[PDB]
Amino acid sequence: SRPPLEYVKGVPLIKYFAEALGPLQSFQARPDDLLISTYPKSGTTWVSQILDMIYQGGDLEKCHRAPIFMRVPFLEFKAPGIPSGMETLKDTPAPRLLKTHLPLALLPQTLLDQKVKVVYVARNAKDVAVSYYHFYHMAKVHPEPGTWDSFLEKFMVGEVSYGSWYQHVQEWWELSRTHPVLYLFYEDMKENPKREIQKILEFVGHSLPEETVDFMVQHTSFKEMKKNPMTNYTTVPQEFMDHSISPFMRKGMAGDWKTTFTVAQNERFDADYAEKMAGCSLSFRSEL
Ligand SMILES: Nc1ncnc2c1ncn2[C@@H]1O[C@H](COP(=O)(O)O)[C@@H](OP(=O)(O)O)[C@H]1O
Numbered sequence: 001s002r003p004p005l006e007y008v009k010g011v012p013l014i015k016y017f018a019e020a021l022g023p024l025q026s027f028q029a030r031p032d033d034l035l036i037s038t039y040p041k042s043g044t045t046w047v048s049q050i051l052d053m054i055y056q057g058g059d060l061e062k063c064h065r066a067p068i069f070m071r072v073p074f075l076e077f078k079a080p081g082i083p084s085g086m087e088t089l090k091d092t093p094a095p096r097l098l099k100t101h102l103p104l105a106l107l108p109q110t111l112l113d114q115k116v117k118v119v120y121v122a123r124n125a126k127d128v129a130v131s132y133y134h135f136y137h138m139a140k141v142h143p144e145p146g147t148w149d150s151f152l153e154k155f156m157v158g159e160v161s162y163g164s165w166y167q168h169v170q171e172w173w174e175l176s177r178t179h180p181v182l183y184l185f186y187e188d189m190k191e192n193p194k195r196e197i198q199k200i201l202e203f204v205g206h207s208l209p210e211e212t213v214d215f216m217v218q219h220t221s222f223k224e225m226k227k228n229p230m231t232n233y234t235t236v237p238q239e240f241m242d243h244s245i246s247p248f249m250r251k252g253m254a255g256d257w258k259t260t261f262t263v264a265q266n267e268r269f270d271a272d273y274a275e276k277m278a279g280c281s282l283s284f285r286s287e288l
């Protein structure tokens with residue numbers, strides 16, 4: 001029950017994912033692949049749906065062909081009895097959309113060699129932290145979260161699945177100076193989706209009718225993605241994800257962190273944060 005994390009090259013990984021890193025060393029990326037990269041709980045499921053929808057030419061029905069995680073293979077994914085993303089990936093027709101949360105240290109080198117385009121989504125740390133906490137309770141493969149207070153503690157030192165969020169956002173921020181990486185912010189997508197969805201289109205080449213963009217905007221909203229079983233993850237074994245404790249689609253909001261963080265925590269955290277994001281131009285909005 002609740003296996004513990006396995007460290008690989010300094011990164012804490014879910015046992016099953018750590019295992020998957022081996023076959024993964026055989027992954028050959030295609031020049032037309034598109035990688036969705038994010039630190040967990042930063043809008044991955046959200047941007048995947050937008051991308052898939054764009055790829056299907058705005059066709060809602062085609063996007064309903066199967067579970068978002070089947071449509072957009074999860075690269076380092078592996079679970080007992082379930083087909084690894086690697087497996088699933090050889091059954092996937094190009095152009096392909098792939099997702100990952102792995103830090104550069106562990107990113108299959110083939111994707112950089114093949115100069116594969118990257119859509120990266122970042123989210124303010126406080127919200128990611130609250131979100132990850134609840135996610136740790138409902139996604140059975142993670143270790144015990146404990147109290148929210150001890151978790152925040154773990155979070156700060158990077159002792160959580162996929163490690164430091166601080167390092168994660170900075171390293172991909174850096175990568176973007178020399179690699180094709182569209183770096184988006186969750187908060188911006190919340191503020192003005194249509195504006196962000198446009199940036200994505202420009203970045204991936206495709207170009208659709210304003211009448212089409214608005215259609216997506218509606219369909220890739222929290223309300224809509226919450227009820228759609230092809231994106232809310234309510235279609236996976238209750239053993240893996242128990243939505244009754246906390247649903248995958250929880251709130252969908254920027255700023256929800258204020259109702260969980262205490263004043264003590266908020267104080268300790270901002271002190272620690274000022275240190276870790278020192279000489280970095282990266283900047284985050286914590287509300288709105
Ligand atoms: N279309 C959408 N618009 C806004 N937030 C969304 C969304 N789809 C999912 N989310 C939220 O984004 C986070 C996505 O997690 P992941 O990065 O693993 O896909 C969760 O955050 P909350 O738990 O704060 O709601 C989820 O509920």
Ligand SMILES: C[C@]12CC[C@@H]3c4ccc(O)cc4CC[C@H]3[C@@H]1CC[C@@H]2O
Pocket residue numbers: 039040041042044069079101139140141236240241
């Ligand atoms: C909970 C699982 C491991 C963690 C996976 C994850 C991990 C991080 C994240 O941001 C999103 C997801 C979506 C699918 C999750 C998986 C569903 C099956 C597996 O047990």
